[model samples]
Target chain A: GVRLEEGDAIDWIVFDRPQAANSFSATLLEQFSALVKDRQANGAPVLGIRGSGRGFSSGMDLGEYNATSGPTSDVLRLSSYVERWLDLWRHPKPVIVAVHGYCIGVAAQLASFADILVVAEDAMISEPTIPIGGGFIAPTWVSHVGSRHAKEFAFLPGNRIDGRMAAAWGWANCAVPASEVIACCESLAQRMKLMPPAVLAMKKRSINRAMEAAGFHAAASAIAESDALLHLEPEVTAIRNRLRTEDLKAVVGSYAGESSQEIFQRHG
Target chain B: DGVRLEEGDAIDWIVFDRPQAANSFSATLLEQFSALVKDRQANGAPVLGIRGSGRGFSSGMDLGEYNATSGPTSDVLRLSSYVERWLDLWRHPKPVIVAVHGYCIGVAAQLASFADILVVAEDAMISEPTIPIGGGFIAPTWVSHVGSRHAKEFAFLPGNRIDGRMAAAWGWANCAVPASEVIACCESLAQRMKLMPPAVLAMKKRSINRAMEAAGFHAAASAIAESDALLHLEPEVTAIRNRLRTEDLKAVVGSYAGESSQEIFQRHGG
Candidate 1:
């Protein structure tokens, strides 16, 4: 369940699935969508979303992702997954995200879409899906961080970036000590709360409008289609199928060209 | 006469040499600038570096000549050519690294912003003071690089300077080095770019720029240039020119400091 806590004028949207490291499940996604929409309507001026576990989110829970047997299932699942982040991007209120520990996959999408992101020093922001055949939609990193950094971050195999590195690359607002992650979010939220509602809304809308005018949505839609095709490729299908019988590390290692442990050691 | 072209080890440099006028533009300089870039492209120069020869990159348009030539019909035509000249830098096939020090004001800032890589001195201060003069039109590159809110903030508030570190932090600059090292840093980056296949670098630039173009950059730019011409005819703009004649141009610009949209409009009679 996702929990929403009211603070003076700011609201904290907590990802409460700590048991699975706050991974997104179908239920969690639905709850997040509904809760955000509800708070948005209920006049939540400022919002901060974060995890309540070891990490911000480890991305989608593979166990719960049952690709329906039908041909259109993958496209639908992927599109829906993409839509959840767009929803956050499209949300009217100013949303800030606090990222720490393992922030990867779709979790990165959330940070990218949010108005501001504050990451803990130990936070590892990554999206290693390109090698695993994931199509990235609304690839916010390109526009947010510029083309060179975006390409370097995305193309590098097993990309995991710490908070300071992420800030240096323009991925986040700033990096703070791990212990101050939540406090940083609260401080940012407090400042945001001080702004008149209309001012904040217009500022957010103006910035987003400029991006959308730059074809953010159209590119995202096109990429979603491309990602769907990538998923259908033989290599991708084989790798995904092997997930059922093999350890997750072994399966990931197969595509990364090195064992998972080696990947971690090399990156860390 | 003030534009100097030099050839280094695989790198071609265009140094703005008019330190006296803060390297302000002139018709001759513009023509020479275009010719040098074309020459570099034809000669297969692996990289090009553009930097200032003085305390600043440029002080933007030559207001004296610009005023004499500007009018309803001529302003449009004059600006069209000016816009195309800037576009040459934007569309250059080879990698162009711009090193900025001192003041990077007006159109000079636009060139730096559009360059493949922008290296700014730690003390560099960038701004477009055209807005307070009531001659501001759209500058799509600013919006493209820094988003709309910051763009509006900068445009609406003329003479508001963003220093190098803030520019880099804001993603408008690739790197901000100490003022003394600006040119050397840019040269080093150009050398690194030279190591990559020129064709690959060209393609990468094309891909990135194509994305921006698709996002309506060219369209916005074209429209904004026209708006700027129209705005130049406004009374407030004429007042700026008049003041430039009687008082110092710097003093005239200083009058609009610490002001933004409503204040600007009110001062200029909307």
Candidate 2:
């Protein structure tokens, strides 16, 4: 796992673990929690999240749960760790997630938590976590991306939607080119700065009230229940173990990384 | 003259036409307008369309009467009290279409800004110089609906009048059709709103307002309160009020600047 960049005006935190395809792990999620707390203590005005390497994020590191003994129990643990991601969901300051590349699996959940999302035209997102028989934890998927897009991805996780498709479904505020995503997000943040900081925080809290009131705080709990159902499958554990040893270069083989389902086939 | 209540197809239209003195929204007219909107609401009228007749939306309140009646116990209270009672529009839960044309200024600006769907005639000139006239402005409701940036712009440059298209772009109004389509277009929308799902409509309405209320209704209200005090004491506003009376522009200033509404309330304060 990567270390949280210690105290600075880290209102803008770039997830910088490119070598691992910027995939999230249990430790990385914990680090994210700590960063959020650090930002709160520093009285940061906003949190701007962008990816360091290829795209925004490749989602969760499958190895985290694969290493556990029981598939169901391990997913439960993964879900609990997912709490770290939720910190952004409830954060008082507005959080803007700019997606420039592929934001798969867990990245989908994280991106949705942002108060505003700016996506690159080439970015792709999907809730492929369901491929392992786990369900989505985020309830506001429909609210963010609209029900049609949420249903398409959630009901059929094997096939993912691209960035343009994501925008049409309301998954993102708007989609720009790969290069313009960050600049546009930064400009948005700069515009917001013209208003008083207290007003921003107060306004953000109100917007999130519905989500919080709906028990979104325990969102990861929803995932835990679903992941627990598929615990009997040894195939899940085997795939987890194999992904840890596999390198991104070999998996994608060329430019297209093997889908999680394809990786599962190799294990079989 | 009595408030002219006109029924045009589905729209229950009320025109504030207190002639002889420019329909300058006397206390009686305020109460009458509020009564009409309230009656429409109580009867669950499909839609309520409000506008003004005979030289634009009542040049705001009548300043002469404001001066004639003395005290915190004057007709100013009656007028403001009626304005407050117009809160029926706030929670009417029914679509209200406002057709703004001509000189839609001051309170006309405030009321139009509050409606569910505002259809401004393309040629309409809309502005609020309440601050220029020793008055403040509306609260979170307007600012949140149109956005804080536009709200602040309106407040900072309180005397600036923008066109209808600009108003729509700023989210001040929903649409700005040609003067010819103003009535027909509003009628079309009002007709359509009658067919919408009530549950979804109410839910969506509450949700949006809730979002605004959550956003800064309280803070905006606090700001409005401060503005009330500012209007009474601010020298810039007071200077303009004095200029209005000396220049025989008592009608314009009293209407917006109030009876003693800290002068210099209108533009060209010099």
Candidate 3:
């Protein structure tokens, strides 16, 4: 479940499903998306989000994703992802995300849409542990960090980069100690809240206008189809077929059993 | 005399043919390039590609021409003319690919900036002009593509070189291949691009181009051309031009940075 705490300068949307690692399911997406879209109705000038438990997120609940069926999910999770995140991205208010503990897969994709992202210094920012999808998340990163780091990170499967590296790569605004992540985010929000909402809205709009004009939106719209097609590939299907017998951890573990170097070498 | 228009089945080859001049663009070559570059029905191939004829793609504008013609008003117009020619590729419908090898310096590098796809030799030395004569003219064209960090790093230092590997890694070029394979590789991609319907290709390119323009590429390029033109007349820049009469370019550049022109070209072999 999600909890919205409305404060003077900032509205905090906390992912409270600590037992589930705060992974997004359809219900969570609905709750968060509504909060983002309807913020003006009952929210502060600046919106900030963080996890309330052990980690930020573990990505989509694999169990929920695999078992779910909806027009948006069945057609492609990538499309649904972009659709949900667009609310935050296009929202008139400035949105900030504080990533602590872990941010992986779907969580990372959603986080990229925020106006500003702060990660705990010790947080693990990772790609999916196994190669189950393609062409969805990494392309968006090229604009933020540049293509070199993005390609290098994507090619080395299951590799996790620390928050400092993400900040150095320009993926996150700043990296702070785990205890300070939320505090840093609030400080940024309060600072932003000082500006007139109209000015802040225009500034974000201006940059986003430039980015969209640079073909970021065009590329994003086409990626879901590519991602959907890749999921049906022989290798991907075979990997997914194993989930019938093995549990999520076992199947994911088996795929990642080989050395990371071996995984990189396979491509070379 | 300085450019070649070789018609091919899959792509037309517009090779810069003046190796003796380091493939630098002369006024004559610039005019001829405008006349020779073809599109759709005007070309034998559905795609077009450009490369240098010799050890490098280009060493930039021919300073000999600069010496031959000197006037402040004409300089702005002349520079704008050259800038407009590069944008012709940007406006092109069929995809235009550029293969860069050897040394690409000064305005030579901006010529590739407008190309739809750019390929470079792994060791090719892509550098800014040695004199630091004027900036804002060049690297601003690069920011929307490569971002400000790499763009500033290159332009801040005169004659600084980044190999094709770094260029490709930085997303300045689409890919970097071995020198020997650079042309063949770009042509192969041209052939692949040719497989698409020309109109579909044109519309897609236009969509992206329009987006780039909306992103302020058009205004930036327009604004910088004037900034560079004004900088050319500044006493500091003119003082360097005045110094060129007494000292060789290598000496003047070495005064600013540790490396000489010959050393930079020789040190980073393309």
Candidate 4:
């Protein structure tokens, strides 16, 4: 589960384990955090985090989580994930994330931390918190994108949006064909590598302030609402159950057919 | 006497006194302007209105200050120091009213950035020549205030003069009105502001200002600091200074007068 590789031209950090679609477990989170810290500190101009097969990341490993009997372990593990993902958002240098295929749940939150996001055109991005009886990304959405768009992503439930729509919401910088995602990102990295590292860092600092002015810090700093969402929503447990049975496709497909408006009617 | 400054119960108005120089900024005038605002803030003034008396608010700096014996470094430092004081107006808990008339030049453009509401008279001209001087900018306020699109237009075309209507349309100024209504308009806004509790007023001001501090102000300071370092690498500033010794200062006076003045800005490709 722990894999960090760097070559002469590019650094690719793969989240292997296609068997579980690289679902994040406590042990995996520890390894992932360590790799990110090292890579970010190493001052690499270009760093890429992707999954080995199919879906980018299937999200939290509920099986292992449920098996961990103690309450203390659960709290400790959740705390670690939050801290690591937070660091990804505030990192000084720019990070380009390429999402292909299924990018659901925790992957969506993690991807939100990236400065530049590139998704495969055919990829589906969704957060089925309503169906699962869990809520995490309510405020994070408005903070990452905008409020209106956050409402759109939230009320939609299991309905998935294509890469182009994601880019339109300013979630990703751009989205491309699945076959071309890797090379496009590499090209972007190569162009970025030409600039002095300080330039990129300073430019990012200047640009981010524009967003900060619009109320990002306030929203992120106040996340008590997120706690409320998590407590009230049990659809998260339902999602965990379907995922465990390997029958997620049936549930998601049925949920997908419903319109966002209908989902909002049922969920809200 | 050029401009008249009136301290009244309702408002304190600063009038641009000089018509001959188009209210061109002199060192003393700038120091006086800073002192007035500083004193007013200290006294717990509810509102401060800066309006022009003669033809315009200001034609930027007095270009006559430059010569072979004098170039940009000293003058730029003086102007930047003053601009910092002006920024305090925006940061202050109290409201600042910039009642503009005509031709608010380089330093005026910067000073306008600090006001909570800038009430500009029709035909007021706003321009900045900092980039043209072949050096750095005192502050990149327009980029943060107006967004990237408008900022690019102003930065790319340094000497192009923009009017009050355009300023308001571009989201640069808060309001654009006829020359006759400048004073009364500003006073009315200040009176409206007097209704709010001073403490809550200050808190609201802080809320908006803090947000800018988090993103806009810090980002601009960082960009300016980098540009300051880049000034050493610029050959155009050096060339402009050299020109003062050999070339005609009369023809190029306005170009190299301010800090990182007009001529120095030409060297920056982007």
Candidate 5:
């Protein structure tokens, strides 16, 4: 599900499941995690990650799981997933997640853990198009973008911002033309390689440690129970059931309309 | 008085004036700064600037004035005074720009965190004291600006210093310029700020600050002092404090000092 291409200055991890839109199944998640671990042990001075297809990812493969996953299951699953992202956060090398096209839900969460994020101007960093779960995504954003933007992004189900807006809001390092994101990331990686490997690692470590000390882990990790509780919310349950029988686009289109209206009014 | 405010047509500058102690906050310094800022709350130019008169921005607290209080409660109130003044600046109606040069340590560093725009001398040493006496207080103030990773790196290692250039890169400072140009930069920014109507600028700051406060920035900051206050009573911290009082301050300081972190790493590999 993932492949690491090595270069003199940096390594690239390309998401390889284009047919599935790079949507992560459990096995794929495990494969990506292993690749990340391998890169951590020994590799180029920097790592660049990008999607292989039309989009970075469509998040998780919901078809892999059943509706009404129990509260205990939900909490445990989220807690475990949080560790997976932390692995990326904890990697020794500088990791740049170059995002393009649609990066939804879990994919967005994964990108949040990068040392640096570069997004294509047109990339969509969105939550699930439905409101099936809460508290899992936005809390991760608080430390990066401040609570105001975090709340702005989270309050609406399936809310997304273009790469430019995300960059303006301090989420991504920068946004470039859709064609330029990979090159932008590589340029940065090449520049980063000039620093002695240890220097970059120490600097990255110091910043990461400061962030961890600031209650980021505490706040972002507060997700498990809250998301479990939200999973049981009637409206959330209704949406998940609808996803089973109804046309996905139509169901999402209905919610996106109300969601956009609510958020737009807040800006006004 | 340790602080003096100069009112100008476009910008009002608040000068930290205790050169003898490098502008460290004494009780009187805090009092003067508080009253000056509070008095100006009702009136001031559209923009306000803060700069030090001494060799450095500040070297943290003036321990001479922070005599032992009756208990932790009293100490908290004493420390809380610093937070109160910082909040006052944070809530000040006018846009606030701070120019930092030389050494900015501990509480002094935290004070800059609240400024709307902060400019630092390119080589300014923004750091905590060499001796690690307390935990939690200084680092939390920086979390909002620099993120937890950098904050923890700064806190976990005593005497860890980031140059102004590094501070800007880490997001703790808005920008770094040549030392001679620090004030000029702030003045330039202040002049631009003066173009905006004061009322609109105030409201603009309010909206941004409210959003940050809503995200728990205020609550976390309000309690920062309490962390150090209680630490002052702890056995480990008190032992360090006593070592300073009874032992050779230089020797005690030197004990914790060593090669730069990178140098240590290099030695092992070499």
Candidate 6:
């Protein structure tokens, strides 16, 4: 399901469901959660996440999502993975990500929540959840970029921001050549390891605490519930029906519903 | 005593008209400013622009009438209302654009930064000199726009000026244009804002600001103000008062911080 590489200074976790475009499955998520928890116990100064094969994880496996089982599956199984994301956020070790190729939806959210993100020049990042009228369960984009950019990402499902654009918008710390993505992450991890482990951990704790004090976690949990409710909206149900009969590509490509501005004006 | 209000087609212009004192805020001026902001809130403008008429934006709160013993410390506390007025701008449905040139110092700089879109003259300089007078609180808006590192640098050093270009690069302002063109640039930007429906714009502003509020925007600013109020009661302000008796303003400023007023102003092209 995933590969874990433990070094003296840094630990690397790679999503290995490449044949599925690295789409997260319940079993994979459970194993990933266990690996991260074990790392927490063993103590790693820096941890990095990457993906094998063509691109990073293509988010949750939509193919497995059927109306009959989707919501319950999310609550029972996927919510466990969400808890792991929250753990990564509150994780004592510095979490870094090297993103290349496609980083969409949940993959993008994970990258956004990391302590540091390095992007490959050829990388494309987006959150396509808006098309389904579903929002991020843990929307960390607002913390990475400002409100305006975060809103843009939430409102425009088709908008794919390239690496340079991401860097300019503060979504990523840096964008390097695609070939150098892992090298960049390695270099960053090495330099981070140079700091005293306790001091590095304390600094991360302070920054994370400041963000939490400002309601980051509270907002995340609230939005998750809101997204669940949004799934029940008529428009969302229509999209889900189309997704069930047609396909994701067809639904997204042909989505002609109300503009986000109109939507917000009507409902905001 | 010097403030001008001119209503344009879709944009209203609020001018700081006291060029002689660089349009420093007096009690009367602040009251009038508060009234104007309230009026705008009641009525609706698609866009609003604020700028100084001459020499700079503002020299901050007028110090001539301020004395430790005779001055109503309430006057300083009353400046809290000025902050509230800026918060009104933040909460206003429509966007506010601030055009800054020449010198933007003290309270004026804070107001410029809080505006939705900031247009700055390349020769513009911004600073808060309150640290040397007594310790002062910085608004969280500073930290929000420019981040913690630069915010600390600006707050610790009382008289340091961040130039317009640096301000834009540091994300303090939207852009930096030539001094001669700043007002025109802001006016054009305001006109562009007029194209959007006012209600839609307001909703958009609300959404953006709600995110800010969630991030402790209001709490941080109010808490910092409380810290500032305590600093006023400290002995440093008393020492500043005694120095004001025998020392010229320039000498007094130099005694407290590195640069004299004239030298600091000259460095910023004021």
Which run of 10 residues does model 1 chain A get worst, by summed lDDT?
A64-73
Model 2, span B1-270: residue lDDT tens: 447778754667777776676556665766777778777764554677877776555455555443421322232344345445555665676667788776676656766655777888777777665446535554233676677776665665545566777778778888888877787887888777777766566667767767766765434543332233223333454566667666766455354443221123334362
Worst 10-residue lDDT window for candidate 2 chain B reads B257-266
Model 5 earns a TM-score of 0.50
Interface RMSD of each: 24.3, 31.3, 26.0, 11.7, 17.1, 14.0
Query: Stretches of candidate 5 above 4 Å error?
Result: A1-268, B65-69, B259-270
| lDDT score, candidate 6, position B135 | 40
- Per-residue lDDT tens digits for candidate 3, residues A1-268, read 8889888888988898877888888899889888877785466788888888888888887665442342124336667778888778788888899999998887888888888999998898888887776667777788788988778777766667788888989999989999998778777777887898888888989989998977667656655644554454556667777876678788777656443434556889
Q: lDDT tens digits, residues A110-221, model 6?
A: 7766888889878878666446635663266777677887777676655567788889889899999999998888877788888876566557756866777776654554
Candidate 4 chain A, which ten residues in sequence have the lowest lDDT sum? Answer: A67-76
Q: Over the full model, what C-alpha lDDT does candidate 1 score relative to the true structure? A: 0.73
Name the runs in model 2 displaced over 4 angstroms.
A1-268, B65-83, B138-141, B197-204, B222-226, B250-270
lDDT of 1 at B161: 69
User: Residue B55 error for model 1, in Å?
Assistant: 74
- Candidate 5 lDDT over residue span B1-270, tens digit each: 988898886778889988777888888788888888777766777788888886898888865544443554466677777887898989998888889999898889888888999999999988877787766678888888888887887887777787899889889889999999998887788788888878899999999999999787897765555556645655566678889788887898788865543345458993
For each candidate in turn, the TM-score is 0.48, 0.43, 0.50, 0.46, 0.50, 0.49
**Residue A21 accuracy (lDDT) in model 1:** 79
For the record, the alpha-carbon RMSD of candidate 6 to the native fold, in angstroms, is 18.0
Please count the clashing residue pairs in each candidate, in the order shown.
Answer: 0, 8, 0, 21, 10, 0
> What residue pairs clash in candidate 3, if any at all?
none
Q: What global local distance difference test value does model 5 have?
A: 0.80
**Which window of ten consecutive residues has the lowest lDDT sum in model 6 chain B?**
B70-79
Q: What does DockQ give for each predicted structure?
A: 0.01, 0.01, 0.01, 0.03, 0.01, 0.01
- Candidate 2's error at B73, in angstroms? 10
User: Which ten residues in a row are the worst by lDDT in model 4 chain B?
Assistant: B256-265
Give TM-score values for chain A, per-prediction. Answer: 0.88, 0.78, 0.89, 0.80, 0.92, 0.85
Give the runs in model 4 whose Cα sits over 4 Å from its true position: A64-80, A222-256, A259-268, B1-270
Candidate 6 Cα deviation (angstroms), residue A230: 16
| Per-residue lDDT over A34-144 for candidate 5, one digit per residue giving the tens place of the 0 to 100 score | 888888767788877888879998888876444345444556777777889898777888888999999998788888899899999999889888887767888888888
Winner on TM-score (1 vs 4): 1
Give the TM-score (0 to 1) of chain B in model 1.
Answer: 0.88
